[PDB]
Amino acid sequence: HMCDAFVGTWKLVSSENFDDYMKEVGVGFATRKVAGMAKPNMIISVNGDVITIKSESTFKNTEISFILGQEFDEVTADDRKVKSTITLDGGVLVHVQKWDGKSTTIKRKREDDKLVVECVMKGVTSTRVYERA
Ligand SMILES: O=C(O)[C@H]1CCCN1C(=O)Nc1ccccc1-c1ccccc1
Secondary structure, eight states: OTTGGGOEEEEEEEEESHHHHHHHHTOOHHHHHHHHHOOOEEEEEEETTEEEEEEEOSSOEEEEEEOTTOOEEEEOTTOOEEEEEEEEETTEEEEEEEETTEEEEEEEEEETTEEEEEEEETTEEEEEEEEEO
């Protein structure tokens, strides 16, 4: 029952400072522009100890499956090859991605009927708000 309130199908309904976040991460111009248009569907499911998060959009379709606290390989939508660890901290799913001596943290939080996602790279924060599909 660890992630019950996250399970479901969610659709992006607002974005703030995302282009700047992607710049900070190192995404190039053309990818930033196309990726910034996307309205991804985030699909979260749990089977035993395995959590699966899928993101489907015109830009890219991605899927990760993981056990909390257990590092894995991820190729991100923008084609970074990262080492990821996802934990639960006070009811927030905290996803840390490490690559090339860099790190970014993506926090997924349930707030009212929304799922609020905060993406942080150094001093740059972006907020991505999702609602139930
Ligand atoms: O898209 C989102 O809302 C954010 C928050 C949940 C995971 N995610 C990303 O991984 N986004 C990205 C991060 C870096 C570069 C590109 C993306 C991206 C952009 C459009 C579609 C899918 C991922």
